[PDB]
Amino acid sequence: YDGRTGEPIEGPIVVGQMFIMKLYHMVEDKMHARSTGPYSLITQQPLG
Amino acid sequence: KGEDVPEPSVPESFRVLVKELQALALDVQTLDEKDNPVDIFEGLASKR
Amino acid sequence: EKELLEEMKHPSRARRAKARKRLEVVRAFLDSGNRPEWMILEAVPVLPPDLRP
DNA sequence: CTTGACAAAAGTGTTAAATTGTGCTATACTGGGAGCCGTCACGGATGC
DNA sequence: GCATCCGTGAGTCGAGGGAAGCACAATTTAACACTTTTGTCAAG
Numbered sequence: 225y226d227g228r229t230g231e232p233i234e235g236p237i238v239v240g241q242m243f244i245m246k247l248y249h250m251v252e253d254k255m256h257a258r259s260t261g262p263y264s265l266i267t268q269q270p271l272g
Numbered sequence: 273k274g275e276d277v278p279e280p281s282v283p284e285s286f287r288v289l290v291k292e293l294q295a296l297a298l299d300v301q302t303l304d305e306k307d308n309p310v311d312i313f314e315g316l317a318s319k320r
Numbered sequence: 321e322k323e324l325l326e327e328m329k330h331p332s333r334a335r336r337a338k339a340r341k342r343l344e345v346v347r348a349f350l351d352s353g354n355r356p357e358w359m360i361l362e363a364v365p366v367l368p369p370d371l372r373p
Numbered sequence: 374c375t376t377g378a379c380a381a382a383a384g385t386g387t388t389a390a391a392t393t394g395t396g397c398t399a400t401a402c403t404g405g406g407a408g409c410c411g412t413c414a415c416g417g418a419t420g421c
Numbered sequence: 422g423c424a425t426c427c428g429t430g431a432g433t434c435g436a437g438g439g440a441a442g443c444a445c446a447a448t449t450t451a452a453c454a455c456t457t458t459t460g461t462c463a464a465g
Contacts, residue, residue: 254435265373268284272434288371295367334420375465384457392449398442414430421424 282312321346 225232262271290312293300302310311318324343328336349356 266371267288291368291371295365297361297365377463377465380459380461382457382459385455387454388452390449390451392447394447395445397444416429417427419424419426421422 287312321350 258270263269264271290300290302302312304310321343324339324346327339328343330336330339
């Protein structure tokens with residue numbers, strides 16, 4: 225059934241129990257932003 | 273200050289490139305429409 | 321350059337190719353205004369220390 | 374807007390002390406050592 | 422005709438990665454009493 229409408233899904237749906245792992249790759253450790261910051265010694269370009 | 277950013281200038285990486293090429297004993301010179309040298313170092317590397 | 325031009329009329333193809341290569345180098349040096357002996361360093365330039373910090 | 378001192382922060386000579394640069398040591402000694410293949414494969418150029 | 426030499430081989434990101442003395446002469450530095458100038462405070 226559809227929780228938003230209460231009407232059923234027009235076709236039967238494969239529903240079961242499956243084992244799912246939460247991987248080490250998280251957006252918390254991957255989101256990054258910068259306006260200004262450190263610069264390189266020689267080229268004076270921003271670091272990485 | 274709420275203004276528009278100014279027109280940019282020569283990158284520092286190009287200045288580093290020119291200085292390294294000079295260190296290789298290569299006379300790299302930036303010229304103008306009339307083939308006269310143009311100082312991209314703001315007079316900071318010209319011996320008086 | 322004059323000798324290379326004169327040798328450029330040799331019937332042999334390899335001789336003309338060698339003359340052409342040597343003459344291209346000579347023409348480059350003549351037109352550029354560079355001197356050949358400038359290819360040997362008497363004073364070695366030293367990079368500014370901030371580029372070699 | 375001024376002198377009329379004066380505590381003090383700064384500048385000025387010498388000196389004793391670390392700190393640093395240089396020479397010298399006399400039995401005889403006399404040509405290095407780390408190398409070491411999945412050697413990377415493949416075009417482009419020179420040149421014998 | 423082959424032999425040899427040389428330059429080339431994707432991008433962004435993170436993650437951790439990080440024979441030696443000894444003596445002696447010069448030289449430099451630290452320190453130290455002294456003259457300063459440099460601020461101040463006092464009234465005129």
